[PDB]
Design an enzyme around this catalytic site. Structure first.
Site, PDB file in Angstrom:
ATOM      1  N   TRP A  80       0.814  -1.218   0.000  1.00 52.32           N
ATOM      2  CA  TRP A  80       0.000   0.000   0.000  1.00 52.32           C
ATOM      3  C   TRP A  80       0.847   1.268   0.000  1.00 52.32           C
ATOM      4  O   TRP A  80       0.340   2.353  -0.280  1.00 52.32           O
ATOM      5  CB  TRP A  80      -0.999   0.007   1.159  1.00 52.32           C
ATOM      6  CG  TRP A  80      -1.851  -1.239   1.212  1.00 52.32           C
ATOM      7  CD1 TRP A  80      -1.705  -2.295   2.061  1.00 52.32           C
ATOM      8  CD2 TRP A  80      -2.958  -1.566   0.357  1.00 52.32           C
ATOM      9  NE1 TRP A  80      -2.657  -3.252   1.802  1.00 52.32           N
ATOM     10  CE2 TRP A  80      -3.438  -2.831   0.761  1.00 52.32           C
ATOM     11  CE3 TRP A  80      -3.600  -0.905  -0.698  1.00 52.32           C
ATOM     12  CZ2 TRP A  80      -4.539  -3.448   0.152  1.00 52.32           C
ATOM     13  CZ3 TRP A  80      -4.686  -1.523  -1.310  1.00 52.32           C
ATOM     14  CH2 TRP A  80      -5.143  -2.783  -0.882  1.00 52.32           C
ATOM     15  N   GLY A 114      -6.752   5.582   1.564  1.00 53.50           N
ATOM     16  CA  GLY A 114      -5.556   6.064   2.217  1.00 53.50           C
ATOM     17  C   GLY A 114      -5.906   6.979   3.387  1.00 53.50           C
ATOM     18  O   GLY A 114      -5.076   7.766   3.846  1.00 53.50           O
ATOM     19  N   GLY A 115      -7.143   6.886   3.862  1.00 54.73           N
ATOM     20  CA  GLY A 115      -7.594   7.670   5.007  1.00 54.73           C
ATOM     21  C   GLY A 115      -7.507   9.175   4.796  1.00 54.73           C
ATOM     22  O   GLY A 115      -7.446   9.933   5.760  1.00 54.73           O
ATOM     23  N   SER A 196     -12.623   2.714   0.399  1.00 53.76           N
ATOM     24  CA  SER A 196     -12.323   3.405   1.683  1.00 53.76           C
ATOM     25  C   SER A 196     -12.553   4.927   1.519  1.00 53.76           C
ATOM     26  O   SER A 196     -13.643   5.355   1.133  1.00 53.76           O
ATOM     27  CB  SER A 196     -10.930   2.841   2.358  1.00 53.76           C
ATOM     28  OG  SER A 196     -10.174   3.366   3.757  1.00 53.76           O
ATOM     29  N   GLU A 323     -13.814  -6.215   7.571  1.00 52.14           N
ATOM     30  CA  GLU A 323     -13.262  -4.859   7.439  1.00 52.14           C
ATOM     31  C   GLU A 323     -12.318  -4.398   8.577  1.00 52.14           C
ATOM     32  O   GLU A 323     -11.267  -3.804   8.316  1.00 52.14           O
ATOM     33  CB  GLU A 323     -14.400  -3.847   7.296  1.00 52.14           C
ATOM     34  CG  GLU A 323     -15.283  -4.034   6.081  1.00 52.14           C
ATOM     35  CD  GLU A 323     -14.663  -3.452   4.831  1.00 52.14           C
ATOM     36  OE1 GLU A 323     -13.548  -2.901   4.944  1.00 52.14           O
ATOM     37  OE2 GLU A 323     -15.285  -3.547   3.745  1.00 52.14           O
ATOM     38  N   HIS A 436     -10.276  -5.652   4.905  1.00 52.43           N
ATOM     39  CA  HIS A 436     -10.394  -4.339   4.297  1.00 52.43           C
ATOM     40  C   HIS A 436      -9.363  -4.192   3.170  1.00 52.43           C
ATOM     41  O   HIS A 436      -8.162  -4.415   3.384  1.00 52.43           O
ATOM     42  CB  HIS A 436     -10.160  -3.272   5.372  1.00 52.43           C
ATOM     43  CG  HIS A 436     -10.258  -1.862   4.874  1.00 52.43           C
ATOM     44  ND1 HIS A 436     -11.462  -1.255   4.589  1.00 52.43           N
ATOM     45  CD2 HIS A 436      -9.302  -0.937   4.626  1.00 52.43           C
ATOM     46  CE1 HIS A 436     -11.243  -0.014   4.188  1.00 52.43           C
ATOM     47  NE2 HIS A 436      -9.939   0.204   4.203  1.00 52.43           N
TER      48      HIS A 436
HETATM   49  P1  LIG Z   1      -8.214   3.383   4.234  1.00 54.91           P
HETATM   50  O1  LIG Z   1      -7.394   2.230   3.782  1.00 54.91           O
HETATM   51  O2  LIG Z   1      -7.670   4.658   3.751  1.00 54.91           O
HETATM   52  O3  LIG Z   1      -8.277   3.319   5.812  1.00 54.91           O
HETATM   53  C1  LIG Z   1      -8.054   4.328   6.724  1.00 54.91           C
HETATM   54  C2  LIG Z   1      -6.780   4.624   7.208  1.00 54.91           C
HETATM   55  C3  LIG Z   1      -6.615   5.644   8.135  1.00 54.91           C
HETATM   56  C4  LIG Z   1      -7.731   6.357   8.572  1.00 54.91           C
HETATM   57  C5  LIG Z   1      -9.007   6.063   8.090  1.00 54.91           C
HETATM   58  C6  LIG Z   1      -9.162   5.043   7.159  1.00 54.91           C
HETATM   59  C7  LIG Z   1     -10.529   4.678   6.602  1.00 54.91           C
END
Ligand SMILES: *P(=O)(O)Oc1ccccc1C
Ligand SMILES: CC(=O)N[C@@H]1[C@@H](O)[C@H](O)[C@@H](CO)O[C@H]1O
Ligand SMILES: *[C@@H]1O[C@H](CO)[C@@H](O)[C@H](O)[C@H]1NC(C)=O
Ligand SMILES: *[C@@H]1O[C@H](CO)[C@@H](O)[C@H](O)[C@H]1NC(C)=O
Ligand SMILES: [Cl-]
Length: 527
Positions: A80, A114-115, A196, A323, A436
């Site tokens: 990632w 990536g949050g 996400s 998830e 997830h």
């Molecule tokens: P995603 O893979 O972007 O997961 C994240 C990571 C950090 C904060 C929130 C979230 C949903």
């Protein structure tokens, strides 16, 4: 040679051989002036015309971001991590078109997760060459700013108005509108898809009036804006922008001066302080993310959703069976990727403190009470499974379901899935389940490559998913009509039918996580 003329100038791509065929890749096309110097924290400025040709033959710079350093050398986490140079000069996109050049092709636009803090379009699991080859759709993906550089908010003040990264995405959807026909694409048939924060981004484009005319349909993988990590409030974006200023020694009195100060900092200094703009964080902390800017977003999005203020069109929404597991090894005591993570009642309780730091004693207890009333008995993995489910249900599954009910209530066809397959190649351990982010390789058709150590059953499943996604984009209906497949029913509220995705049997079920989601979306917001 393969040259395409776009509004801003000529671009050259490269030929790729996929599955005894050919796909044309245009990697790293610029779509805005690089947001450098006096342009940092501002909305993206349109691109200056160019003579000569632009060589779009390698992936461009990824946007500045902090990297996961918890598992150095481990593919499970490093897959990632960004695979191109980081740089503020990062507003670029990619186009994959089938060969030979299609006439009027449906277009898929990918937006990564990536949050809102990390991510890049150039990841191996976002390679659009398979989809172009196999389904003859055109795949587009863009890089957009993340973290403070993309979501720093001093609301009102246009020097740092908030939501810049969302505007990056929006300027890119725009680029497709004005340019994709030259690549044989149909601007009237564009489907956004993302996962996400990407999926939450897609959902926000559904609410943003500036995005309404820029796409047709939407696919949301494990994410929506009503997720608790998805939208920062005006009050706490403010505290964060200021806290970033104190940490970086840029505290001024004139707000515009604070921004000017922040502009004369190395990105590293800003990246390294991002994490401390909050008093206590969680593995799911989104320190700088979407806000109600009064521009891209004109009101609190829960209100807009509730009151039917969005693009009326079809949506395809879904989540994976486990998830929450991914996040338990970035903080939760007793958890490790290297053992079976059998934890105790005390480790579970401590685990809630990690995941719900700011909630009351009674709030953490109510979660415990709802998720630990079990049977037999004395099952050692009880607390392990339960904590994963707590994080999964609260952060992803329940908000996705809730979003879907609400959206569908306004007349539009919606389709819900439950992805239940754990990849044969998953580097993470068994107890973490169907994680997830691990449906993505199936959507993008990686298992179709039979030299890649996937089972045949995975090749088949991917082929069906790829077909459903493509038919959804082309025709607003995610069926596979040719191979005696289970029909995928619309998700109505009240009935709430959804489709399971797995390698053995595909099933229609009803009312995913009914009891759990009743706890989350109805009881819990009050604590
Ligand atoms: P995603 O893979 O972007 O997961 C994240 C990571 C950090 C904060 C929130 C979230 C949903
Ligand atoms: C789009 C899709 O799933 N097509 C499948 C194909 O992969 C498979 O070869 C065939 C076998 O009869 O069944 C059909
Ligand atoms: C492509 O398809 C659209 C229908 O969605 C149509 O309006 C448009 O004129 C077509 N353009 C061509 C001929 O490629
Ligand atoms: C703050 O400084 C900026 C930049 O010089 C100026 O444009 C703005 O009018 C000032 N505002 C206030 C409140 O002093
Ligand atoms: Cl503007």
């Amino acid at each position: 040679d393969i040259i395409i003329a776009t509004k801003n100038g000529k671009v050259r791509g490269m030929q790729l051989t996929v599955f005894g065929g050919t796909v044309t890749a245009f990697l790293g096309i610029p779509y805005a002036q690089p947001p450098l110097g006096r342009l940092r924290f501002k909305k993206p400025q349109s691109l200056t015309k160019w003579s000569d040709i632009w060589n779009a033959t390698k992936y461009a710079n990824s946007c500045c971001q902090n990297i996961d350093q918890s598992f150095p050398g481990f593919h499970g986490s490093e897959m990632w991590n960004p695979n191109t140079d980081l740089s503020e000069d990062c507003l670029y996109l990619n186009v994959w078109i089938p060969a030979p050049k299609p006439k009027n092709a449906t277009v898929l636009i990918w937006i990564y997760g990536g949050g809102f803090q990390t991510g890049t379009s150039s990841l191996h699991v976002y390679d659009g060459k398979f989809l172009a080859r196999v389904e003859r759709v055109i795949v587009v993906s863009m890089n957009y700013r993340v973290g403070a550089l993309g979501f720093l908010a001093l609301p009102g003040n246009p020097e740092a108005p908030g939501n810049m990264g969302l505007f990056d995405q929006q300027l890119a959807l725009q680029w497709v509108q004005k340019n994709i026909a030259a690549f044989g694409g149909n601007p009237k048939s564009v489907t956004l898809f993302g996962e996400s924060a990407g999926a939450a981004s897609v959902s926000l484009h559904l609410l943003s009036p500036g995005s309404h005319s820029l796409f047709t349909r939407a696919i949301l993988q494990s994410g929506s804006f009503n997720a608790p990590w998805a939208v920062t409030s005006l009050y706490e974006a403010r505290n964060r922008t200021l806290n970033l200023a104190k940490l970086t020694g840029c505290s001024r009195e004139n707000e515009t001066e604070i921004i000017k100060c922040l502009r004369n900092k190395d990105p590293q200094e800003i990246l390294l302080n991002e994490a401390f703009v909050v008093p206590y964080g969680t593995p799911l902390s989104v320190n700088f993310g979407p806000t109600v800017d009064g521009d891209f977003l004109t009101d609190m999005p829960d209100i807009l959703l509730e009151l039917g203020q969005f693009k009326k069109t079809q949506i395809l929404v879904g989540v994976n069976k486990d998830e929450g597991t991914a996040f338990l090894v970035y903080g939760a005591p007793g958890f490790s990727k290297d053992n079976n993570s059998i934890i105790t009642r005390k480790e579970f309780q401590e685990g809630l403190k990690i995941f719900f730091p700011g909630v009351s004693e009674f709030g953490k207890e109510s979660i415990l009470f709802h998720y630990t009333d079990w049977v037999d008995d004395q099952r050692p993995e009880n607390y392990r499974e339960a904590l994963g489910d707590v994080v999964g249900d609260y952060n992803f599954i329940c908000p996705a379901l809730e979003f879907t009910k609400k959206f569908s209530e306004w007349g539009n066809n919606a389709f819900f899935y439950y992805f239940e397959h754990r990849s044969s190649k998953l580097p993470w351990p068994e107890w973490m389940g169907v994680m997830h982010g691990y449906e993505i390789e199936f959507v993008f058709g990686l298992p179709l490559e039979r030299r890649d150590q996937y089972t045949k059953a995975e090749e088949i499943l991917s082929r069906s998913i790829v077909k459903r996604w493509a038919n959804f984009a082309k025709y607003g209906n995610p069926q596979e009509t040719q191979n005696n497949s289970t029909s995928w029913p619309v998700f109505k509220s009240t009935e709430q039918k959804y489709l399971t995705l797995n390698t053995e049997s595909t099933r229609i079920m009803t009312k995913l996580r009914a009891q759990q989601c009743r706890f989350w979306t109805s009881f819990f917001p009050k604590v």
